[PDB]
Amino acid sequence: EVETFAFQAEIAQLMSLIINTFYSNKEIFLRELISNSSDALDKIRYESLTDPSKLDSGKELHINLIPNKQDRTLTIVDTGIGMTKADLINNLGTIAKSGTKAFMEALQAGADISMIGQFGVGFYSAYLVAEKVTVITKHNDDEQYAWESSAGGSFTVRTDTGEPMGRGTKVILHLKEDQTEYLEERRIKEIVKKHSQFIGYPITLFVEK
Numbered sequence: 184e185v186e187t188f189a190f191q192a193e194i195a196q197l198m199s200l201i202i203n204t205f206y207s208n209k210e211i212f213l214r215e216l217i218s219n220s221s222d223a224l225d226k227i228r229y230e231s232l233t234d235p236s237k238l239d240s241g242k243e244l245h246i247n248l249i250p251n252k253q254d255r256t257l258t259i260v261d262t263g264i265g266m267t268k269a270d271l272i273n274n275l276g277t278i279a280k281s282g283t284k285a286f287m288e289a290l291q292a293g294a295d296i297s298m299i300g301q302f303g304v305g306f307y308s309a310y311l312v313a314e315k316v317t318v319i320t321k322h323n324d325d326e327q328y329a330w331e332s333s334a335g336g337s338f339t340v341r342t343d344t345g346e347p348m349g350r351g352t353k354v355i356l357h358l359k360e361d362q363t364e365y366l367e368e369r370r371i372k373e374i375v376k377k378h379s380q381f382i383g384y385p386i387t388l389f390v391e392k
């Protein structure tokens with residue numbers, strides 16, 4: 184079954200701001216997603232020091248960037264800690280509510296959209312370039328789930344029947360028609376070099392067939 188949920192008012196407001204505000208510096212979405220992947224990788228690495236069996240679902244700690252011109256998607260894959268069903272529906276959304284309030288207050292005071300990561304809501308910067316975001320995730324303590332939202336105040340959660348991941352997260356960005364530059368190899372390399380050159384995990388930019 185597919186379960187549909189309403190975003191909390193603050194989150195729906197943040198999504199509308201990201202989608203409707205005129206802001207040309209859209210490239211910052213990639214550093215935000217890579218930062219979340221890096222944080223998830225730090226988490227599983229730290230937990231594995233006390234419990235080595237937490238790496239039975241995969242020892243490799245990496246980030247893959249996969250462009251697909253045919254599907255018009257940019258996928259950010261990590262072998263991080265992943266997210267449980269409770270993380271997807273409640274936990275992260277609860278943390279995001281206070282972060283959103285602080286961010287929108289900072290914007291009113293003169294801060295810009297690029298500072299979004301300091302408020303812990305950098306994931307939502309994906310809506311600067313994507314019309315729809317699909318999140319496939321697998322945490323050691325739960326099943327593989329698919330979260331999805333095209334904004335409009337709702338998101339869906341379902342058990343995923345695609346290729347099993349072992350552990351980690353895939354953020355699938357269904358790009359807006361005018362944002363296809365983020366599928367270009369030299370554009371992605373430029374963005375990674377500018378904003379994500381010191382990430383402590385291998386970042387592999389896949390090339391198109």
Ligand SMILES: Cc1cn(-c2cc(F)c(C(N)=O)c(N[C@H]3CCOC3)c2)c2c1C(=O)CC(C)(C)C2
Nearest residue numbers: 219220222223263271275276279306318330352
């Ligand atoms: C806030 C927030 C961060 N991430 C998010 C989104 C992500 F894709 C990741 C990731 N692991 O790649 C990630 N990692 C952190 C939690 C576990 O380790 C750090 C967080 C999400 C949110 C949401 O509100 C919606 C969501 C639950 C669909 C996604």
